[PDB]
Symmetry: D3
Subunit: 91 residues, 6 copies
Amino acid sequence: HMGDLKYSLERLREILERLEENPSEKQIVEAIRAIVENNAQIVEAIRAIVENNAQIVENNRAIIEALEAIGVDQKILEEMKKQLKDLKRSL
Amino acid sequence: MGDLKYSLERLREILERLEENPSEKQIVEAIRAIVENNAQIVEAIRAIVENNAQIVENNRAIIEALEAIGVDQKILEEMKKQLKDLKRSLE
Amino acid sequence: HMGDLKYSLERLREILERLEENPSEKQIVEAIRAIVENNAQIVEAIRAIVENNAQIVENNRAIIEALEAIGVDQKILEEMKKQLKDLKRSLE
Amino acid sequence: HMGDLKYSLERLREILERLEENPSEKQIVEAIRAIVENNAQIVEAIRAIVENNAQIVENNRAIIEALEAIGVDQKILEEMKKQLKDLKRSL
Amino acid sequence: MGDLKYSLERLREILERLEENPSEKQIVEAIRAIVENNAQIVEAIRAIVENNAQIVENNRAIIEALEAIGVDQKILEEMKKQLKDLKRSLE
Amino acid sequence: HMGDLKYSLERLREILERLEENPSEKQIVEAIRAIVENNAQIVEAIRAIVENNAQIVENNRAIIEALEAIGVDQKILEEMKKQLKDLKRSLE
């Protein structure tokens, strides 16, 4: 959409220079039509950005779940410590 | 986002009404609608920027945790010498 | 910039009041010019948000690449497990 | 057992000096009895060492199992990479 | 270990036989049995030492893996600057 | 030492042949002396194996202490998860 944004805006500026040269009701209306079409594209882009942000957060969420599991669980960790307590006793 | 989609719907309706019976009253009406739509675009953008800021700080915490996921070089240093010791007595 | 956004919008509202107070072709055109200038700044702010999102995704990509290497390589794991097997055989 | 070893051996050396002073069939037999009792204790100690070694290997085995799980599984890891491929595409 | 327990059983039997009807033939017999028991103690010890050597080398591999379990300081260095970058553009 | 073991045993076998060849009270006593000397070296070798086992257990103890800290502290994990929650709330 960033392409349509750049050009939807370039189109907009052309009409504006035009409008400022030969102001008329038709040119004003034409300029407003162009504005509306540019806002429609701004809205579309924003809707996409907000969607990208949502996916980013889901990826970040998965990253934390991974971090959550990187350690050694306290169930096996507890097993090894007792094993060591035992060995130290016998020894 | 909800407000955006509708302030854009409201904007498109005036535009065709303007294009139907154009008048100074309608042009001004349409401009007021544009301004209201732009103010809502601006709020959305500000929210997106706030979300980006919070996203970047979460990424920072993720990296802080990655830094600490390994085993300390102090503790790792003690074990190697322990190993060095053993391998000497043993031989 | 977020500031230039805030003010190209405040400027825009000022003209709109003027326009509604004393409507005229000159004021209408002036309001349209202000609109285009505000749209230009909306577009630039959007352009930067898209830039920032791409860098964020790149950073996320590095984070995952680091998570992939946090484990112990399966070449060392393979060697240790074999050692454990041999030991268990000799001791028994 | 290391205590009984040290003293079972000290006892042994006493008889030996004794034996070497007044050699006799009774002292020889007495010395052999002492030897046998010392070997019995050496065997007991060895049996314990071999048991300690067995427990050590079991602990080492658990340590490797832990190392085996410290990473992030290739099932979630695969999920995040696709999530990123998706994001990169849309974006 | 099996051989140990029995060369010790064999040794104890001669001892009581020696103590029953002591003779130079029996004393020499008992000494031969002792020597055979000691040779078997020595083999056991040598095996235990071999096991200790293999144990120590497994521990070395365990520590080598612990060293590599973290995230490289090179990769970790790249991400922080990435974060530094973002936080600058963003603000 | 493992070497002094090997040789106090070879020495021991030599006397035993002598003893069996020409038995005598002097040779018997001499064989017993050799035995005690071999037992003394068995005991020392055992004493070192017990020493080495204790250091091995100590090293194993450090390895487990390092495994306990390989995870990400639950204080950082707590903070990140909260951040994720807030973000999900603002974005929605």
